């Protein structure tokens, strides 16, 4: 509605206001009592499939896991390396950013001190040990799963961990009811993979889609990420460090150009008018 | 089965059972009557039909209704559904030595539960007895029950160690998650409502605004060690979801 | 049924329409199976006619005075003592359902509301030991011969 | 005023005048059963149009039928007392008087060969109470009033349902009341489809051939013509200047000299206004542009008389050479179009395969009933019977209007039979909307909604009773007697009774009404529902129907609803609401004549609200003048806007009609959040009575009508002055104004004393007049259970302080004093029934006697030489109320049972313990044993105490009324002979017995004393004929359930105090329970020394959006204030003349105050009681929007010496010190709450166990135990205490020779744990054993 209450309670409100206030308090009522069963049979049917997930062995010494990376895409880092491993436990020998400098024998517990120490060097990504990863027979052992929230330390046998699980996502339920680049912070550019191209200015450009946009620090770790499209003009190059609050990618929302890698005379080649194409002039440019 | 009124009820089960064999002793007989074919074709097409109602009513055609002009609860009905005997009585069952109450906020510890003095003789009230028998008050068991019911000064002298050290379930329906279910040490209190201490509340998503609160006892030493060492208050601090604390003051 | 059992006894020698003598005991067989049938605790088909009869004669009542059949007032269409007519509406009680929704919803059947009225309390069970301990232990400070000959009496 | 208005006058804040009073509250259960019950010959409406209906019927041969002649109802046999005494149903017999009409076949028309006529007897119905309730089986139950979608014609779409395309699919619908409905349907393809009752689709063309109609006349109504004509060279046609509408020119368009449109080009608007100009119509075109367009007619050749081409044909070339070669110049063709006139009817043609009636019948029969093979008859039949037979169809005149209307007829007034023109149109729109021309219509807007109350549902079941019994005439009409079948002999009343009792009473829409206070039966008999027959389900509800649409403002309350899941299903009507004849609902309006605002009221519907614009009541009229803004804030099409001084057309009537009356009480709603109004308006209905009713201080203005208006107060019906109080019976002499020139006119109001609820609350009724004091006629007599001279009184009003105590108040709770639990503030009464039932079991009739076995005298002490306990002996929990012994059976015993019984010889004999006890935790006082016994058997004696009490009452009361009926008629038997002469000397010396022998005279005095003579004898053998009438009835046994012989009924009432742990709450939706009982010496006192007694928490304020009850705590404390300063200057009672200014000051605050209110016509006496009532406080008013402002309490606190700010410093009783900051303290309007804590309290250690599956039963009231629920089973699993669940689902509840030992071993000192297979997994393996499938335990 484009008339707001202008009022307050302090104030008291118009009938009219009150009566078109009802509409979002009704709305809002009936959206609680009615999705909190959608609620409970997601939740009955997270905890159907979670059923037998029991802690069978301690270590089953099984090969590398996942790599683990933070969430730096699309905007600021929200969840960094910090808190997304601390209670993983490593699948292969991570080594600091100094070459030959390990900290970890394939398997360890990554308490805070760790995370401190890898925290304090500029390592990025790390393999760490996963639940699916695990070779278990029937189940899955504690050094493929990690430490324990509620107590802390490393898992002991006997738990059941699909239980606990199923009721940890399904409990915040009914919580959840309802053109161009610019870089903000200073940093190195680096382009992941890149089709890289020099354009008739003689600037950088893109001719492929698997391109990405990465704002690397002075430590080496990147800081954002950004995606840039195909046929994209770029108004910076490869491995500048250039300040933020600069518009760096340029492309037009709806033109998607054919943009040729190479230069050379453009002969119309396998143009045949009147069975393929049909003959258009602009009205105002003529070109 | 008779009820006080005077009258019967029974399950439609019976009356299943009833049709179908009276359909087919009627087939019984027309078939050494020689009657034509169409008749018993039909015989047994309606013998059919009542063995899948039987089987399941409202399956292969129309549901069979009864009196009440409802449809029969077939015994496939009674073991399918929300209804059934799998989730109502098989994973969920009725329970026994507990009770209900309305929640009230408390100055008390944190691994303390206000139960009310009433409830308390009505739950360990065999330990009463068997307490009364060893400390040979009572003659007899049925005199201890005279004794509890005359509610004197010995029962409470009993209650008041009988329950120490005995740690007592509470529950809020609904359970969403692991803290749901939280062991208390009791401690006697005149009154009528479950005392609850505050920082608990958060926990069990709880408002002191009439919910209402469930009380169980464990029986066995395995249960009351099981209680004491993994269900008690003190040891759930943090969230099997994540590990920041749930005891934060609100 | 009735209709196949009445084919054999029509004769057209007889002069009349078939229908005529296939009906009455096409409406005997009916009554016949609606009297055994269509009841959980079969009735001798006496009392179920005089409840029929009970039934007409209550409608009749109903017709004239407007207001319930007394069962006084009863006796004298009955004919009979009126202790036989209080006999018959005892009989009337139909068993209803243990699933009736009892209730609101389906979530209260009355299956749910009935009482195992045929098990011992656990207090009994109780008493019927401990006073089977105390016989032994009484029997076993009596003489051995009053004790074997009281149990064998 | 009114005289009793002088007692207390409640000061109010109203600012805008106030132009119509609020209607009765239940004028629409009163209007909607007075239809249902009065005689209307022309009117058909109620008994009269359901016999009309079906009434005259005929037999099969037509020699006989039944003509309804009149009918009437009989006098009610019990009056409501006796019925709810007797449970037995308030109701009243019909009697119809009909008459016989009988023809023969051996004359034409011999019509006139007999006639029976006479009056019948069939079914009962029950009464309305005076209240506007029903009495059904000697309980209170009230009928909810549905709202249903309409019967008519309905217009829908589809939003996203079609994925593939996204298109929407139109669709119609026609509904009728009672009936086959009927559906057509739009397909992706543009295909017209036809449904009944929602089954599969078939093609219209179906439909359209089922009603003789040609393929030609099909498409001649459904579509325009194009003419094709041949100049024996060339093709020509006739254009129609507005059909080429921006199209593309398929060929050059010419003209007779000119070129307009080039082939590939668009036809542009400027074309057409050339075309238009010239007036050019006949052109040519080639051969290519008619190639894809369809023949709309068959054509042959007249040579041979074979079909040259067939209709809906799409022709070529060769088809037109052989139309020319056939001589056929003269061509129509269909129009088609892409934007205008879309071909659907053209492809529903081709899809369909039916090409006659026959085959169109056929289909339509195998649809309705498959399998079944169709006959020549059949089909046409069903198809009538459809929707062509008064008896199976009908729309009724609601239906046909709204049907009518929705198609743009004029006509209100039409038949509820569907014909081929109402069909046609309905098709002809649906293209219509499909094209583009109109629109869609809503479905829940409120004119498309009907409301429907108890009486159209009573009469639908007189309706379907009527058919059940001529399912049965139809037969005894044409196989019955001909000339000695008297008509009461083949007419059986036990069905329709059967249909309107199981409507009363086992119908959805009937339940027991809410009787905790005036306001639940207010807001429960005003309630909206949208649920059973007919309705949706709770399953069933979307979004659509539950939120609140713009239509509802002024007819439904958008504030009231449950919080369940049925939050958008049951609402209740607005206090201004009413009820149009077709119900619908539509809300008064003040006219506005050229901006003056008459006062004459105008009732505008919901449909026709749209078309005006309408100002809300937040503009100000400039005395009979125009408003004071040129732009003022107003509604219409559904949206706000700003309108001049000219363009409003209509004014909101009243500030209150948006809300309903149960939010209306909330003070100060306007400066509150609409989540908490909403659950402080529902809790507002769970209040209790009190032992007193506490006058609220922050009032609404509504409280004194909705008391009237709720009925539970004595209402005087005749002014008079009071002639005698007392306890229970109120009599009051009229004057001589109402004065009826016949009879005593001296009334009596007998009051009803305590009685149990629906709720098992008390009932009181307490005189508020005093002996020798006039009263006005519609004034209050005696007070309600919770009404104070004439205002409702939910609850209590007290001090409260906005200060965190010690966490006692952590989460919403509430710290109370000692002082309101000594002074019984909060005090209730309950009163429960107990019934003990005597049967004749076939051991032998159970025997109700004061000798038990095994029992102590102690015990018996209590019951008479019957049995039965005294009347108001105090009784505990665990007593013997009535002694009640049952022949034991046949027992077995063990060998030390009898063992024991040979060593001490005691011998039970055939007697079993089956008395009444009271349930546990009841201690109280009998205050009534009421005793039926089945006739035939004796009765008890104290049976014969209680009928000879019954009797002497009775007696005297019946005596009492005649002496009062005497001193009042004697006012004319004597006056008579006062006329024509007074003899005081020797007439009122002699006894009045020695009046009838004065002095003689002519005829005229000798003919008075005759017609006095007259009046002496109907006096004579009236009254004794009733007291002959009552003893008998008394004397009479009463009818029981077969197998009783004597019930036995203990009223017993408990006095109910206040515990830790009851809920309590506000009006503004800040509940919350006591946590602690705390002295007084140990509450916060302010420096005067008075301790407030409620402590709640501060910070439960602002988050919660309720502002509003700080204002009402500020607005209680001035009002307190003002209260105070009286009482204090009254104990030294300076001056009546400085009482008078002191009040007169007090009542003018306000700027612009609706009451002008003046005390120099009042008496001193009336200023001194006045005082005297608002001695403790003088109440205020205050209108849901037209609140008092800041400013107005601020000059109240002023006139009170109180602070300002209204906060106040405290000092901590514990210790004695100051709090840092002052503390809001003032008094508050607190309710009490039936969620009371006793009531919930259960604990179960070895009770009952189920039957089939030997579960421990669950429900405090049976004592059964809680049930363990799944989800616990999971969070206990997770924690992984095995052993704990394993007891909770093996010992607790499903071993029986588990829980048996733990229970013995228990008892032995020995917690040691036994496991068992659960019965419940046995019955499951047997269960589904027998159903075919085999399993078997694999042992190892």
Same mark, same amino acid.
């Given at each position: 509605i484009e008339t707001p209450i202008t009022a307050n309670f302090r104030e008291g409100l118009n009938v009219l206001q009150y009566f078109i206030s009802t509409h979002g308090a009704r709305k809002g009522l009936a959206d609680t009592a009615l999705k909190t069963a959608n609620s409970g049979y997601l939740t009955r049917r997270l905890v159907d499939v979670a059923q037998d997930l029991v802690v069978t062995e301690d270590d089953c010494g099984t090969h590398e896991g996942i790599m683990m990376t933070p969430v730096i895409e699309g905007g600021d880092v929200k969840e960094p390396l910090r808190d997304r491993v601390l209670g993983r436990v490593t699948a292969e020998d991570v080594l600091k950013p100094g070459t030959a400098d390990i900290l970890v024998p394939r398997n360890t517990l990554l308490h805070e001190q760790w995370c401190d120490l890898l925290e304090e060097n500029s390592v990025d990504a790390v393999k760490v040990r996963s639940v699916v990863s695990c070779d278990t027979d029937f189940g899955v052992c504690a050094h493929c799963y990690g430490r324990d929230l509620a107590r802390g330390h490393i898992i002991n046998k006997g738990e059941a961990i699909g239980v606990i699980a199923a009721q940890s996502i399904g409990e915040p339920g009914t919580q959840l009811t309802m053109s161009s680049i610019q870089v903000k912070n200073k940093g190195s550019i680096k382009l992941s993979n890149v089709k890289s191209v020099v354009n008739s200015s003689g600037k950088l450009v893109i001719t492929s889609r698997n391109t990405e946009l990465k704002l690397i620090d002075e430590f080496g770790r990147t800081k954002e990420s950004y995606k840039v499209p195909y046929g994209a003009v770029l108004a910076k190059g490869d491995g500048e460090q250039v300040a933020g609050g600069e518009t760096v990618a340029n492309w037009d929302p709806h033109t998607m150009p054919v943009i040729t890698e190479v230069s050379g005379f453009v002969r119309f080649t396998d143009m045949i008018d009147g069975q393929t194409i049909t003959r258009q002039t602009d009205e105002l440019t003529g070109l | 089965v008779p009820l006080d009124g005077g009258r019967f009820a029974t399950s439609d089960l019976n009356d299943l059972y009833r049709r179908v064999i009276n359909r087919n002793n009627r087939l019984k007989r027309l078939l050494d009557l020689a009657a034509p074919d169409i008749i018993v074709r039909n015989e047994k097409r309606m013998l059919q039909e009542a063995v899948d109602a039987l089987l399941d009513n409202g399956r292969r055609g129309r549901a069979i209704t009864g009196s009440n002009k409802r449809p029969l609860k077939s015994l496939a009905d009674m073991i399918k559904g929300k209804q059934g005997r799998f989730r109502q009585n098989l994973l969920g069952k009725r329970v026994d030595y507990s009770g209900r109450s309305v929640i009230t906020v408390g100055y008390l510890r944190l691994h303390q539960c206000g139960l009310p003095k009433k409830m308390a003789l009505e739950l360990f009230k065999p330990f009463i007895y068997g307490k009364l028998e060893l400390r040979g008050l009572a003659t007899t068991i049925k005199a201890a029950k005279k004794m509890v019911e005359r509610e004197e000064a010995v029962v409470w002298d009993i209650l008041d160690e009988v329950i120490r050290e005995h740690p007592v379930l509470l529950n809020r329906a609904?359970?969403?998650?692991?803290?749901g279910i939280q062991a208390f040490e009791p401690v006697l209190i005149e009154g009528k409502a479950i005392q609850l201490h505050p920082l608990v509340c958060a926990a069990y998503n709880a408002d002191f605004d009439g919910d209402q609160m469930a009380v169980h006892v464990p029986l066995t030493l395995e249960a009351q060690l099981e209680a004491r060492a993994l269900m008690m208050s003190t040891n759930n601090i943090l969230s099997p979801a994540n590990g920041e604390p749930i005891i934060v003051p609100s | 049924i009735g209709l196949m059992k009445a084919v054999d006894k029509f004769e057209y020698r007889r002069g009349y329409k078939f229908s005529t003598y296939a009906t009455w005991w096409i409406r005997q067989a009916i009554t016949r199976s609606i009297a055994d049938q269509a009841r959980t605790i079969r009735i001798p088909v006496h009392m179920i006619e005089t409840i029929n009869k009970l039934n007409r004669i209550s409608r009749q009542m109903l017709q004239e005075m407007g207001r319930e059949p007394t069962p006084e007032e009863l006796a004298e269409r009955m004919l009979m003592p009126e202790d036989k007519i209080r006999k018959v509406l005892k009989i009337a009680k139909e068993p209803i359902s243990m699933e009736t929704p009892i209730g609101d919803d389906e979530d209260s059947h009355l299956g749910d509301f009935i009482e195992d009225t045929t098990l011992e309390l656990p207090l009994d069970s109780a008493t019927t030991e401990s006073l089977r301990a105390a016989t032994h232990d009484v029997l076993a400070g009596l003489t051995a011969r009053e004790a074997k000959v009281l149990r064998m009496r | 005023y009114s005289y009793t208005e002088k007692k207390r006058i409640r000061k109010d804040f109203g600012k805008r005048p106030q132009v119509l009073d609020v209607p009765y509250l239940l004028s629409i259960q009163l209007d909607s059963f007075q239809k249902f019950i009065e005689q209307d010959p022309e009117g058909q409406y109620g008994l009269e149009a359901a016999f009309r209906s079906v009434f005259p019927i005929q037999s099969y041969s037509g020699n006989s039928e039944l003509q309804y002649v009149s009918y009437r109802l009989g006098e009610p046999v019990f009056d409501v007392q006796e019925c709810q005494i007797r449970g037995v149903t308030y109701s009243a017999p019909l009697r119809v008087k009909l008459r016989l009409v009988i023809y023969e076949r +051996? $004359?034409? +028309?011999?019509?006139?060969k007999d006639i029976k006529e006479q009056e019948v007897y069939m079914g009962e119905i029950p009464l309305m109470t005076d209240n506007g309730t029903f009495v059904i089986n000697g309980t209170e139950r009230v009928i909810v009033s549905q709202l249903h979608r309409s019967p008519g014609v309905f217009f829908d779409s589809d939003k996203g349902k079609t994925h593939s395309s996204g298109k929407v699919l139109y669709n119609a619908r026609i509904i009728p009341y009672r009936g086959s409905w009927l559906d057509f349907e739009f397909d992706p393809k543009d295909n017209l489809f036809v449904r009944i009752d929602r089954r599969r689709k078939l093609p219209a063309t179906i439909i359209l051939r089922a009603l003789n109609y040609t393929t030609e006349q099909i498409l001649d109504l459904f579509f325009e013509k194009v003419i094709f004509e041949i100049r024996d060279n060339k093709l020509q046609m006739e254009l129609v200047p507005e059909r080429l509408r921006g199209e593309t020119a398929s060929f050059d368009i010419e003209a007779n000299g000119k070129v307009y449109v080039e082939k590939g080009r668009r036809i542009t608007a400027r074309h057409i206004r050339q075309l238009e100009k010239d007036d050019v119509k006949l052109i040519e075109v080639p051969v290519e542009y008619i190639a894809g367009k369809v023949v709309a007619k068959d054509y042959i050749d007249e040579s041979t008389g074979e079909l040259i081409c067939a209709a809906n044909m799409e022709l070529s070339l060769d088809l037109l050479a052989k139309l020319s070669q056939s001589g056929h110049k003269r061509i129509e063709t269909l129009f088609t179009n892409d934007l205008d006139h879309g071909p659907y009817i053209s492809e529903t043609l081709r899809v369909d395969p039916t090409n006659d009636r026959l085959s169109a019948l056929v289909e339509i029969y195998r649809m309705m009933r498959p399998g079944e093979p169709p006959t020549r008859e059949a089909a046409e039949s069903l198809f009538e019977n459809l929707f062509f037979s008064e008896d199976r169809y009908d729309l009724s005149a609601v239906g046909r209007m709204k049907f009518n209307r929705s198609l743009l007829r004029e006509e209100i007034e039409g038949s509820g039979i569907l014909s081929k023109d109402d069909i046609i149109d309905v098709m002809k729109k649906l293209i219509d909307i499909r094209n583009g021309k109109g629109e869609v219509d809503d479905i829940d807007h409120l004119g498309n909604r009907r409301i429907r109350s108890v009486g159209e549902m009573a009469e639908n079941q007189f309706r379907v009773g009527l058919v059940r019994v001529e399912r049965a005439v139809k037969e005894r009409l044409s196989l019955g007697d001909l000339d000695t079948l008297m008509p009461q002999d083949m007419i059986n009343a036990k069905p329709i009774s059967a249909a309107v009792k199981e409507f009363f009473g086992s119908s959805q829409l009937s339940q027991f009404m809410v009787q905790n206070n005036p306001l639940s039966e207010i807001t429960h008999k005003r309630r909206i529902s949208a649920l059973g027959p007919g309705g949706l389900t709770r399953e069933r509800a979307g979004f659509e129907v539950r939120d609140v649409h713009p239509?509802?403002?002024?007819?439904?309350?958008?504030? +009231?609803?449950? +919080?369940?899941?049925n939050i958008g299903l049951i609402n209740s009507l607005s206090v201004y609401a009413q009820t149009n004849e077709y119900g619908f609902l539509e809300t008064p309006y003040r006219k506005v004549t050229d901006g003056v605002v008459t006062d004459e009221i105008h009732y505008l519907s919901a449909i026709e609200e749209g078309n005006y614009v309408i100002a809300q009541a937040n503009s100000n009229l400039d005395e009979e003048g125009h408003f004071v803004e040129d732009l003022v804030t107003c509604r219409s099409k559904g949206e706000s806007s700003l309108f001049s001084r000219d363009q409003v057309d209509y004014m909101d009537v009243s500030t209150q009609q948006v809300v309903s009356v149960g939010a209306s009480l909330i003070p100060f709603l306007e400066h509150d959040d609409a989540n908490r109004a909403l659950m402080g308006a529902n809790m507002q209905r769970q209040a209790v009575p009190t032992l007193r009713a506490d006058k609220p201080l922050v009032g609404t203005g509504m409280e004194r009508a909705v008391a009237v208006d709720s009925g539970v107060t004595a209402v005087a019906k005749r002014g008079g002055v009071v002639q005698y109080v007392d306890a229970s019976r109120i009599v009051i002499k009229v004057n001589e104004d109402e004065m009826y020139p016949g009879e005593a006119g001296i009334d009596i109001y007998n009051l009803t004393k305590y009685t149990r609820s629906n709720q098992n609350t008390c009932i009181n009724q307490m005189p508020c007049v005093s002996l020798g004091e006039p009263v006005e006629r519609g004034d209050v007599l005696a007070d309600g259970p919770s009404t104070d001279l004439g205002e409702l009184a939910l609850g209590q009003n007290m001090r409260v302080a906005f200060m965190p105590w010690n966490g006692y108040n952590f989460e919403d709770s509430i710290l109370v004093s000692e002082r309101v639990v000594q002074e019984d503030r909060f005090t209730t009464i309950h009163i429960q029934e107990l019934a003990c039932v005597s049967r004749d079991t076939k051991l032998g009739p159970e025997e109700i006697t004061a000798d038990i076995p095994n029992v102590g005298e102690a015990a018996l002490s209590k019951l008479d030489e019957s049995g039965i306990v005294y009347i108001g002996a105090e009784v505990t929990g665990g007593d013997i109320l009535v002694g009640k012994v049952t022949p034991k059976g046949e027992t077995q015993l063990t060998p030390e049972e009898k063992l024991l019984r040979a060593i001490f010889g005691e011998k039970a004999s055939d007697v079993k313990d089956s008395s009444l006890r009271v349930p546990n935790g009841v201690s109280g006082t009998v205050i009534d044993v009421q005793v039926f016994t089945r006739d035939g058997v004796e009765k008890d004696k104290r049976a014969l105490e209680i009928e000879e009490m019954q009797l002497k009452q009775a007696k005297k009361d019946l005596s009492e009324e005649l002496q009062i009926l005497e001193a009042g008629l004697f006012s004319r038997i004597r006056a008579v002979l006062v006329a024509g002469g007074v003899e005081a000397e020797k007439l009122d010396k002699l006894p009045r017995d020695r009046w009838l022998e004065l002095g003689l005279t002519d005829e005229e005095k000798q003919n008075q004393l005759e017609q006095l003579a007259e009046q002496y004898d109907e006096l004579k053998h009236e009254f004794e004929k009733k007291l002959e009438a009552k003893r008998r009835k008394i004397t009479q046994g009463d009818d029981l359930a077969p197998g009783v012989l004597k019930i036995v009924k203990v009223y017993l009432a408990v006095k109910r105090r206040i515990q830790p742990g009851d809920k309590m709450a506000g009006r503004h939706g800040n509940k919350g329970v006591i946590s602690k009982i705390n002295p007084i010496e140990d509450m916060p006192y302010d420096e005067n020394g008075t301790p407030v007694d409620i402590v709640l928490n501060p910070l439960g304020v602002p988050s919660r959006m309720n502002i509003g009850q700080i204002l009402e705590t500020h607005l209680g404390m001035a009002a307190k204030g003002i209260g105070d300063k009286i009482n204090a200057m009254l104990k030294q009672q300076q001056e009546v003349a400085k009482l008078r200014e002191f009040i007169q000051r007090a009542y003018?605050?306000? $700027?612009?105050?609706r009451q002008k209110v003046d005390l120099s016509t009042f008496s001193d006496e009336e200023v001194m009681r006045l005082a005297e009532n608002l001695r403790k406080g003088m109440p205020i008013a205050t209108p849901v929007f037209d609140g008092a402002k800041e400013a107005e309490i601020k000059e109240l606190l002023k006139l009170g010496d109180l602070p300002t700010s209204g906060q106040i410093r405290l000092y901590d009783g514990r210790t004695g010190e100051q709090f840092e900051r002052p503390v809001t303290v003032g008094y508050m309007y607190m309710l009490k709450l039936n969620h009371l804590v006793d009531d919930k309290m259960h604990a179960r250690s070895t009770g009952s166990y189920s039957l089939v599956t030997q579960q421990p039963l669950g429900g405090k009231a049976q004592f059964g135990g809680q049930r363990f629920g799944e989800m616990e089973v999971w969070a206990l699993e997770a924690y992984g205490a095995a052993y704990t669940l394993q007891e909770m689902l093996t010992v607790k509840s499903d071993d029986v020779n588990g829980r048996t030992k733990m229970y013995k071993n228990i008892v032995d000192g020995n917690h040691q744990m036994e496991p068992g297979m659960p019965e419940s997994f046995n019955v499951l393996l047997k269960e589904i054993r027998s159903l075919g499938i085999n399993i078997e335990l694999e042992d190892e």
């Open positions: - | 609904p359970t969403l998650h692991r803290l | - | +051996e $004359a034409p +028309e011999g019509t006139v239509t509802h403002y002024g007819r439904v309350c958008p504030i +009231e609803t449950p +919080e369940g899941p003018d605050l306000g $700027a612009d105050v």
